[PDB]
Scaffold this motif. Sequence first.
Motif, mmCIF file in Angstrom:
data_model
loop_
_atom_site.group_PDB
_atom_site.id
_atom_site.type_symbol
_atom_site.label_atom_id
_atom_site.label_comp_id
_atom_site.label_asym_id
_atom_site.label_seq_id
_atom_site.Cartn_x
_atom_site.Cartn_y
_atom_site.Cartn_z
ATOM 1 N N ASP A 253 -52.156 -9.476 -50.286
ATOM 2 C CA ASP A 253 -51.325 -9.522 -51.457
ATOM 3 C C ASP A 253 -51.457 -8.257 -52.309
ATOM 4 O O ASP A 253 -52.253 -7.346 -52.006
ATOM 5 C CB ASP A 253 -51.656 -10.764 -52.275
ATOM 6 C CG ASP A 253 -53.073 -10.769 -52.754
ATOM 7 O OD1 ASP A 253 -53.930 -10.087 -52.143
ATOM 8 O OD2 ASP A 253 -53.339 -11.502 -53.717
ATOM 9 N N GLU A 254 -50.626 -8.237 -53.350
ATOM 10 C CA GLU A 254 -50.382 -7.104 -54.235
ATOM 11 C C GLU A 254 -51.660 -6.521 -54.807
ATOM 12 O O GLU A 254 -51.751 -5.344 -55.170
ATOM 13 C CB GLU A 254 -49.482 -7.555 -55.410
ATOM 14 C CG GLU A 254 -48.023 -7.883 -55.058
ATOM 15 C CD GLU A 254 -47.218 -8.441 -56.238
ATOM 16 O OE1 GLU A 254 -47.776 -9.206 -57.063
ATOM 17 O OE2 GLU A 254 -46.010 -8.122 -56.334
ATOM 18 N N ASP B 132 -47.726 -7.626 -50.810
ATOM 19 C CA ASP B 132 -47.219 -6.316 -50.448
ATOM 20 C C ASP B 132 -47.190 -6.061 -48.941
ATOM 21 O O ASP B 132 -46.213 -5.524 -48.434
ATOM 22 C CB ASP B 132 -47.987 -5.202 -51.128
ATOM 23 C CG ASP B 132 -47.304 -3.859 -50.947
ATOM 24 O OD1 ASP B 132 -46.073 -3.881 -50.830
ATOM 25 O OD2 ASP B 132 -47.967 -2.797 -50.907
ATOM 26 N N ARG C 50 -39.338 -1.854 -57.475
ATOM 27 C CA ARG C 50 -40.599 -2.339 -56.908
ATOM 28 C C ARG C 50 -41.522 -1.187 -56.460
ATOM 29 O O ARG C 50 -42.750 -1.210 -56.662
ATOM 30 C CB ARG C 50 -40.329 -3.263 -55.719
ATOM 31 C CG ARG C 50 -41.513 -3.436 -54.777
ATOM 32 C CD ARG C 50 -41.232 -4.488 -53.726
ATOM 33 N NE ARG C 50 -40.983 -5.779 -54.355
ATOM 34 C CZ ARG C 50 -40.381 -6.810 -53.771
ATOM 35 N NH1 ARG C 50 -39.964 -6.745 -52.503
ATOM 36 N NH2 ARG C 50 -40.215 -7.926 -54.461
ATOM 37 N N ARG D 276 -45.337 -0.153 -57.537
ATOM 38 C CA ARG D 276 -46.417 0.117 -56.560
ATOM 39 C C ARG D 276 -47.083 1.476 -56.788
ATOM 40 O O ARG D 276 -48.268 1.652 -56.503
ATOM 41 C CB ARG D 276 -45.881 0.242 -55.112
ATOM 42 C CG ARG D 276 -45.365 -0.986 -54.363
ATOM 43 C CD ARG D 276 -45.052 -0.602 -52.906
ATOM 44 N NE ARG D 276 -44.043 -1.447 -52.241
ATOM 45 C CZ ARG D 276 -43.608 -1.283 -50.985
ATOM 46 N NH1 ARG D 276 -44.098 -0.308 -50.230
ATOM 47 N NH2 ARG D 276 -42.689 -2.101 -50.461
ATOM 48 N N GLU E 286 -46.766 -2.493 -44.264
ATOM 49 C CA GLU E 286 -46.467 -2.578 -45.691
ATOM 50 C C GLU E 286 -44.987 -2.888 -45.936
ATOM 51 O O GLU E 286 -44.524 -2.863 -47.089
ATOM 52 C CB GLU E 286 -46.856 -1.308 -46.452
ATOM 53 C CG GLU E 286 -48.330 -0.975 -46.453
ATOM 54 C CD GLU E 286 -48.583 0.531 -46.448
ATOM 55 O OE1 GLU E 286 -47.614 1.338 -46.519
ATOM 56 O OE2 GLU E 286 -49.770 0.923 -46.364
#
Lengths: 49, 79, 277, 1173
Positions: free
Chosen positions: A48-49, D4, D1166, D1170, D1140
């Motif tokens: 995840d992020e 992500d 987005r 990031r 990714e």
Amino acid sequence: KSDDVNGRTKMYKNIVDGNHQMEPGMPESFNVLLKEIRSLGINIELEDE
Amino acid sequence: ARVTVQDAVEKIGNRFDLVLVAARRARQMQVGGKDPLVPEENDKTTVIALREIEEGLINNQILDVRERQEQQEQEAAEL
Amino acid sequence: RVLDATQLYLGEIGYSPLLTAEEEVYFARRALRGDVASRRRMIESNLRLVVKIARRYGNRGLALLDLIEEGNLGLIRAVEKFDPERGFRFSTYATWWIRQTIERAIMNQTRTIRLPIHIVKELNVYLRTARELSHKLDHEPSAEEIAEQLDKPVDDVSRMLRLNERITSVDTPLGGDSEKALLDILADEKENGPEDTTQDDDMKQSIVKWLFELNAKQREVLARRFGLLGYEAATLEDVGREIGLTRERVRQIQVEGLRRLREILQTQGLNIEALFL
Amino acid sequence: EEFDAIKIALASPDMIRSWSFGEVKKPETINYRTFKPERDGLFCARIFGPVKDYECLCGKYKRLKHRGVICEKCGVEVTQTKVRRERMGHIELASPTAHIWFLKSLPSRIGLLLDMPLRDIERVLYFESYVVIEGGMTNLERQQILTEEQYLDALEEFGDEFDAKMGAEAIQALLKSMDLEQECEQLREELNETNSETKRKKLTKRIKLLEAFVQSGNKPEWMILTVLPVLPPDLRPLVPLDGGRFATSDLNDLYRRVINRNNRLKRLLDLAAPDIIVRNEKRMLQEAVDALLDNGRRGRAITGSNKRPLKSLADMIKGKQGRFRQNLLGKRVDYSGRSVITVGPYLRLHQCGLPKKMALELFKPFIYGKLELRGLATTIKAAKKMVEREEAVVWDILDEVIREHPVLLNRAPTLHRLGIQAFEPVLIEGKAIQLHPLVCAAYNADFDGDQMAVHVPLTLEAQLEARALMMSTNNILSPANGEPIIVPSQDVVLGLYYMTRDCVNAKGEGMVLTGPKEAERLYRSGLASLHARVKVRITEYEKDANGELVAKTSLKDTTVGRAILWMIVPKGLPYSIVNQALGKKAISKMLNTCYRILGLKPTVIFADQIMYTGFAYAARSGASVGIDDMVIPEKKHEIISEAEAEVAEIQEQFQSGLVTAGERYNKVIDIWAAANDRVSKAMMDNLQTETVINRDGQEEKQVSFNSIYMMADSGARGSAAQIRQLAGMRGLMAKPDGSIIETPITANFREGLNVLQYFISTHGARKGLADTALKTANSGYLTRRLVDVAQDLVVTEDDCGTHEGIMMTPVIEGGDVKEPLRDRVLGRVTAEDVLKPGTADILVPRNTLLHEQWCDLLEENSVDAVKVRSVVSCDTDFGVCAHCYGRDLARGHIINKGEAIGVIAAQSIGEPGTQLTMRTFHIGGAASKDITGGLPRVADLFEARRPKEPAILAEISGIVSFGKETKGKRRLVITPVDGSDPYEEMIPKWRQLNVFEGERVERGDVISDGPEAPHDILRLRGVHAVTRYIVNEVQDVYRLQGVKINDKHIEVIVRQMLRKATIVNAGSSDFLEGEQVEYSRVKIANRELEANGKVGATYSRDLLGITKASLATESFISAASFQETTRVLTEAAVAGKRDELRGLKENVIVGRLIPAGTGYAYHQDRMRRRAAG
RNA sequence: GAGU
DNA sequence: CCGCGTCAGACTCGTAGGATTATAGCATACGTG
DNA sequence: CACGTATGCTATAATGTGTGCAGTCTGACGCGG
Ligand SMILES: [Mg+2]
Ligand SMILES: [Mg+2]
Ligand SMILES: [Zn+2]
Ligand SMILES: [Zn+2]
């Protein structure tokens, strides 16, 4: 329109309330894929992020 | 606007951004109940937005301007 | 190189020497007295018997190798419970154990939904009886024909034959064409459609609006007691204990609130009556 | 919920235990009587969760009143039943087992890592022989196989000090104890000694394995499984059919085998059983596991009673039935309907007839919502029942909603994007969809029973996407070639042809008319024919330098018919365009002209208008087909008898034994081919100008108005070829062998074939029809590979700021100007001017898109060749710039950034092949090749296959020196000027060289005759050379079939082929020799090297075929979803690779927003999120 | 089996 | 090289449900209403 | 105690599999001998 379970129900209620809002999530079939891969014995994880 | 979208695309330029701009405007009318500039003439929100853009009333940057104007006045009201 | 599991195993068993009676007796005396070698030699020498028997019992139970392993388990019980002192030969004794163990294994594992031995054996006698019946009745046998033969309830026979209903693979494709199978047709019945789900939202929310029409006291009593806007369906004592001591007063206000709801329905029930489908 | 990236690595025994929420120790599914899950079984609810929401099994805890409660009586947690699809379990294997994917799926991985041959590993696993894990005594070395009897010898002799074992245990131990670091350095040392080519590859392979293994953090032990995961119940369901049957997944049967065998093994070990039995069971276990994971991989797939092999886990991921292809890249969809289609001549271009009944269901929720705003429906239940009853107010509401709401129509197969188009629906009573005629082209729709699918764009965003991007009115031009795809066809052409065409005098020759209104009036009054020659005063508008229109009145000489069509013609266009007799080919140019001058809105109106008048006059004409219309020339029988006496002459010359059978066969065939041509000429002369029957002074000659000739001449339908078979001679038929029959068909269809002629026809006919059904798979497969390799390519940037580009010449292959410079170069950015002082004083500056204006100027000036900016020569990393691409051919202006160009390219190239594979085969009948020969050539090009006998090229510039010969085999001792060291190359004896030694040779001068390999071209003459080779060689095929595709599409794909580059010499990074990395990433590294100095990276770009290029993308989800999925996943799992999610494929699989088109805005937002954390 |  | 293996091989629509076999007979033992 | 589910034991001698099908597809690209 397909798998996203939460999405479809939420979208339906939005459509009945006029607001044509998109509330998308993750296709359940994807979830299943991962589970199938893990039952294979390959670790496939989401970082995840 | 309804049939051909050519002049509307000529105003904004990028087709894809035209979509985004008109949708954000149409969402305002749909949800917020924000007032249309052009006479509806019995037309749907999306069509209204595309006319508005064609005539050069709505713009991505103009939408950002009204967003900040009104939000900032709301913050001023809070304080 | 032969990598066949079966062929490898059969080769290895082959290279152990077959026993005579006196040899079996000598070995087995020491095997009961605990001679790790003795038991091993008797086992290994008599594996070939196991394969002969598993060869017969296969057919449709299970893979030959699966039968062979269960058979081996029977043979081991036989070596443990063999009596050297009794003049009866070993092969004779072992045969019983091997056949027993294989049959019992193919009665619990042969079915996806595990059927108990009792049910299975019941069912088998119904089957063999059906076969005799069909041998004289030319035509196949009915539930009641088999039941008449056993002098038993038809429901008994029917329930047994229902259990014999064998499984269908979800992946097996339909229409010869390798396209869509059972899974491709089969719905999720438990998962309601967004139509049903959205109808419940509408229901639950109309009840909120209806509850607010009533008195603050009635609505709160109803909410707490039904477990509607509260968490738990609080009993009369719980609701009374939190508001007004009188447990009996909770019943009074509750029943009062139900009747005011009925009035709203007789007036504006024109919407509520349509909730009967 | 939103992540992500996604990583695949080896599943450790311990990691598998983490996922598990219970150990499944029994095969029991459920109870036979109370169909409830059995204790510790495959469906155990104590392990996988409750069957019913917020209810325990025995029913002690019910509802949310007991939230996270764990029943003491039954042992079940009380939660959502949802979890039964989520929770996994596990099984403890008594003996370790190999993972078949990392064993059988090549490269061996496990075998490759131990440097142990696969056979060798297997002998160990199946317990045929021992392997030495550590012979402390150097007497016996590592990994050296010992047979059963070999183990007995050293047993007494060495013993103790050597450890050698058997089975999965042995291999796992061998793997555990190998230290990757050390052996990597040892092997690197050996790489320096004498690295031969194949040795260097295998060593570098293990080097990269060892390196990647340490980088992944994976351990070799994990190749062997001790813990085996168990998939959730709902993903291998056991459900009851209505009739009391049960239906289960095959996985449950496979798992029941494994469990039983493993638990029997535990029993056999508890009983201390003899070792032979222990062995058999271990093999048994391995077999069942292998079947569970991948059934028909190792040997005979374990079968059901049906005979058919059971479907294992891998089968659910693998192939078309697999997850990716079937349920993820493509999906079943709600708000979708389908029906038969029929014509809607009355429709305007942006409309379609939508059946009321269908629309009522498709817009269900919109109707309920509006019902609640009208206050008509109190509740949703009431609204539902109101629509069931189909009340008259509901029809008014439905009519209200569908106004301004676009719907998508689709027709299969969807070969290019125009196979899906958006329309405003027009509600109609009646069950078929009505489609507009002019877009039948794009759909390839003919109404012989065709059906189409309807889709409802739901959101404001999707509705906008449909109206703006996908509306039929907005999408006219083919994205493949710059041509209008909406063109009148059939009856429309026919009608326009009828009005415009002239006849001798007829009614009211040489009248004088005030305006075209007087003409219409006169025609419809019945005082003038449509073909009457006449003088008419027309006012034609010519558009000025600016937007203002300059009109000019003129008396022209035209028919009544032409004047009337001028009314449909917009002001702006000239009268001479319509003044000719109109056909399909003139009308496409008409439309084009209108688009370029007036624009979109005018052309759309004009197209509809043309359709209305076209059909209208088609009908009025009364045009029909009688047997008299097919005219046989009088001199058939004569021509034929002569040809027969001729053939008889060659047959008699054969019986004499002089002329060979082959010579006679050829002469007979030539006789009949020539006879056929002659009869056809006769037919067409006698038909085309048979109106030798005119007037005014006396007899005069004119064009025939025969119905078939009109149809054919207009281009509405038929052609001279067809008519040959109808009125002429049928001609010579070709056998299914491909060889031609000696006797041709002398008859025609009007005459009627006899038994033998008909029979002879059949072979060819059927061959064609079979080709449609069967070969479209191979065409379409090509489409798919192209699509997959171009996926990622998007317009990322406006201007790359590059000066690069390819020099296009006008294709004068042979002599005829095959593709004029103008047509090859239009709508491209000029990279670099060319100042030739000239007639029109043209510089045309850099970064100018070639408008039709500048193109016209090029022709006046006679420009020779021009450097044009190209996709291949773009500097943009991770896509291309708008400038290097140029015009979006479908739009008629410069491409918008964000557009997914790759996909468009692949579709555009693939589709014609796929369609022409159906066109000249359902049809392809008689013989006078085609596509079946061509596409294999094209595929061999895109896949970069080196030809069977390739031409030889000079590697480096210098002076040619011939040397020695090995019995005829030519050696070459070549010696340049500055690189003085000699370079030698062996050549086959029989291969003759075109050039003659001793020469000053540039890099890549052709020595031998033969086909060029694209790799060798790249390696010697660089990118522009190979790019232009592929473009031209491909275009030759498509050009032969009359298929227009712009070079830029093939250029897109070429670029994708040249993605990767092998580095030959170390950089400042950890690149080093022989690693192959994406050229984008190493050029970006070189920008940072330029800044920092340090060791620069010397590389060399490599060409890759389409299949391998897609498999080489860093995205393993894209790779795996494409093909080869078992292998792709072992590769990625071992590498510990993370995706990714940059590409579209990848996003679509996870159901996210595409990084292209509309989604580019959101995706860059987005991306900036990031970048700032 | 229907249109490619 | 030779030879054996593995890998790929268009898109939507349709129709219809469905198969087989057989596991002895009895005595003792364990868990829940 | 009973009912449902399970484990158990049996003694003429018997001691190395097979079985039911598969029908051969093809052009390509690597990988051990
Ligand atoms: Mg047709
Ligand atoms: Mg058709
Ligand atoms: Zn419970
Ligand atoms: Zn560029």
